[model samples]
Target: ASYTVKLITPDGESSIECSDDTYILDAAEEAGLDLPYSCRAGACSTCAGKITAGSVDQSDQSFLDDDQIEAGYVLTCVAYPTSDCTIETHKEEDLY
Candidate 1:
């Protein structure tokens, strides 16, 4: 099944239809939405975003620590939506 993803950016907000099996970033790109991303390995924060609602299953935990994840920060490249989600894009990852 597919889910609805609402992405909020500094410029504005955009929505897309996403699949549970595809990464959020991939879905965004497919929808012609230019969301932030690089490495595509979840090792970086280029695609970082904060989840405002709904749930997601993440595959890459390299960039965010447990605390950050608990705080709702997610890497789009490695995140898959388990339910409809609203995310704030362009989040900075200050992993040190």
Candidate 2:
């Protein structure tokens, strides 16, 4: 099925409808938004975000450590929303 994603960026916020198998980064692209990213393979932290609300399935990612993952850090390049998500984007590795 599909889910709603609330994306918070450096400038402001936006929302998009995405498929369960679609990465959040791709969904943002389809919504006509340019989000920060470097490695699209989910091995980097360029597209990392803080999930303030909701949940996602990002078991495909491997960059972040256990703490980060447990704290709700998600890599948009690999994260697929499982529910309506309120996420803060544009965050990088150093920010953590």
Candidate 3:
């Protein structure tokens, strides 16, 4: 029902608890980690992060393209943990 979410950032790697029923960004905030974000509507990439491992159930994302999504990018605002995952944040501009 829940998964481990590891956030890799320039500062360091921070871990949090997430659930399949919860959005990743919301879970991150609940964990007291300041992950980037503007809109929690999947309309922006401010909550973008790259999945280095595992997978998530995300759809209807407005920012990233198919190729970017295939390349491991995810909009955390709309993404939910399908499995324990390692994600790196602050790479919205690096999607190209």
Candidate 4:
């Protein structure tokens, strides 16, 4: 089964139909959301987000801290939404 997930970023929002088995980053990619990430291996927190709604199944435990999780931070690369969800991607242009 597939659930509709909405991924929100500072720039805008995007939505995708995803299965419980699909990771958040992959889902974002499938929906054409340009969430910055590296390794694509859940080891990186570049594609991190806070789950504003719904639930997710995470396979990687060493990615985020307990505080981050308490604050709803999730590493999108390894996250699979257990239900339809809304995630906030805190991103800004690295103008240096």
Candidate 2 global CA lDDT score: 0.89
- The residue-by-residue lDDT of candidate 4 on 3-67, one tens digit each, is 88888888888888989888878877877778878777767667778888898887674667677
Ranking by lDDT: 3, 2, 1, 4
Q: All candidates' lDDT scores?
A: 0.89, 0.89, 0.90, 0.77
Off by over 4 Å in 2: 93-96
TM-score of 3: 0.94
lDDT of 1 by residue, 1-96 (tens): 799999998999998999999999999999998887778998988888999999889966587888889989999999999999999998974444
Candidate order by decreasing TM-score: 3, 2, 1, 4
Could you give candidate 2's per-residue lDDT for residues 14-59 as a string of tens digits?
9899999899999999999999888798898889998999999998
- TM values, all candidates: 0.92, 0.93, 0.94, 0.85
* List of clashing residue pairs for candidate 4: none
Candidate 3 colliding pairs: none
lDDT of 3 by residue, 1-96 (tens): 989999998799998999899998899889888889898888888889999999998886888888988999999989999999999998887865
Model 1: per-residue Cα lDDT at residue 94: 43
Model 1, stretches more than 4 Å misplaced? 93-96
* lDDT over C-alpha atoms for residue 55 of model 4: 87
Instruction: Tell me which of candidates 2 and 3 scores higher on TM-score.
Output: 3
